[PDB]
Design a protein around this ligand. Structure first.
Ligand code: VT7
Ligand code: CL
Ligand code: CL
Ligand code: MG
Ligand code: NA
Ligand code: NA
Ligand code: NA
Length: 326
DNA sequence: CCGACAGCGCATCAGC
DNA sequence: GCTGATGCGC
DNA sequence: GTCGG
């Protein structure tokens, strides 16, 4: 939090560009700038100083100068006064409402939390559950609660079939003292890049987690990706825990290391690392790392037997999960 | 100056 | 129905 | 919005 003021301002700008302008490159530029400044280990004294960092250019440098001189940004002060922008921004805080639906709702006079509740029939399923847990989904998850949730998930997965491996990723695997949701990577020897010798591998786990009333709602679900809602059990007379977002990603077991790399993140770390792989002539996704030929077409999967193997290919020294919080 | 910006699962819709 | 584009969110 | 070539 050395430069928390600056990185808050850049984040609010990124959200403005994504949600209101629908200019996704400005949104990623602002977030990259915010990220490179959050890890800069000096208290920034001028835009010139910040311009030296990659991702901060002239425009952001001027904005930082204004913010340092005045403590605020006039552009953001006007944005906060604009009722249309404020309405659109607020609606995207509901899970499943992105910039397009937010502007659609605002155009029809659906602009507050009450309005969504009275127009629940204009929402799709995901958006309906997002509204239902709107307040809970804004709460952070203490790591101590993440530890209880992991113990349930792993034990219930083990009960379905002892050959499953479930791995909690996200910021929890990076060591964070609090997480926004739970991200679970799942493998089973029956599911490899060569064959799926067992159907319903993800369904069986989801079902068992619903049976014990851990999973409470479903946002979306397919053969390899589940997104939904869970809740820890409370003791007698105790207030209930908040409802929590849970994502489960079933990945072919022989592709575990690209999967765990992807699911551990952060998202900006993935973007940097994947960008760097391109510069080095490779493409990385959650399944494989592949060379790119002279035509930039993805070649065949390269052998991977560790996270570090993926770093080696692109000539990065290995970074532990705790150092990928970008 | 300007092309590229990481990569992809699931939900929904439009055209057929 | 399937196919492709778009939305949304990892 | 930023930047590598
Ligand atoms: C959102 C996002 C996620 N990911 C990867 C990287 C994340 O760490 C992983 C889990 O997504 P997440 O939205 O739960 O992020 P997170 O890192 O776990 C988090 F720190 F944002 P939080 O703990 O609050 O969920 O999916 C991407 O590669 N691209 C993305 O755009
Ligand atoms: Cl843009
Ligand atoms: Cl792998
Ligand atoms: Mg997460
Ligand atoms: Na710079
Ligand atoms: Na949203
Ligand atoms: Na997640």
């Amino acid at each position: 939090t050395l430069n928390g003021g600056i990185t808050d301002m850049l984040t609010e700008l990124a959200n403005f560009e994504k949600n209101v302008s629908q200019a996704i490159h400005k949104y990623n530029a602002y977030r990259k700038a915010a990220s490179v400044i959050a890890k800069y280990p000096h208290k920034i004294k001028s835009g010139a100083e910040a311009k030296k960092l990659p991702g901060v250019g002239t425009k952001i440098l001027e904005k930082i100068d204004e913010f340092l001189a005045t403590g605020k940004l006039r552009k953001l002060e006007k944005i906060r006064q604009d009722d249309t922008s404020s309405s659109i921004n607020f609606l995207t805080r509901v899970s499943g409402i992105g910039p397009s639906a937010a502007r659609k709702f605002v155009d029809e006079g659906i602009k507050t939390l009450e309005d969504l509740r009275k127009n629940e029939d204009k929402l799709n399923h995901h958006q309906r559950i997002g509204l239902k847990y709107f307040g809970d989904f804004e709460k952070r998850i203490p790591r101590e609660e993440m530890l209880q949730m992991q113990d349930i998930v792993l034990n219930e997965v083990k009960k379905v079939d002892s050959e499953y491996i479930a791995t909690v990723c996200g910021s929890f695997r990076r060591g964070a003292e609090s997480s926004g949701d739970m991200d679970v990577l799942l493998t089973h020897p029956s599911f490899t890049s060569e064959s799926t010798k067992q159907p319903k591998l993800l369904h069986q786990v989801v079902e068992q987690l619903q049976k014990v009333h851990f999973i409470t709602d479903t946002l979306s679900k397919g053969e390899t990706k589940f997104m939904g809602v869970c809740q820890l059990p409370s003791k007698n007379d105790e207030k209930e825990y908040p409802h929590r977002r849970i994502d489960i990603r079933l990945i072919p077991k022989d592709q575990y290391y690209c999967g765990v790399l992807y699911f551990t993140g952060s998202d900006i770390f993935n973007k940097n690392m994947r960008a760097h792989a391109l510069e080095k002539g490779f493409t990385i996704n959650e399944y494989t790392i592949r060379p790119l030929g002279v035509t930039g077409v993805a070649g065949e999967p390269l052998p991977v037997d560790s996270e570090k193997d993926i770093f080696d290919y692109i000539q990065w020294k290995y970074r532990e999960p705790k150092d990928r919080s970008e």
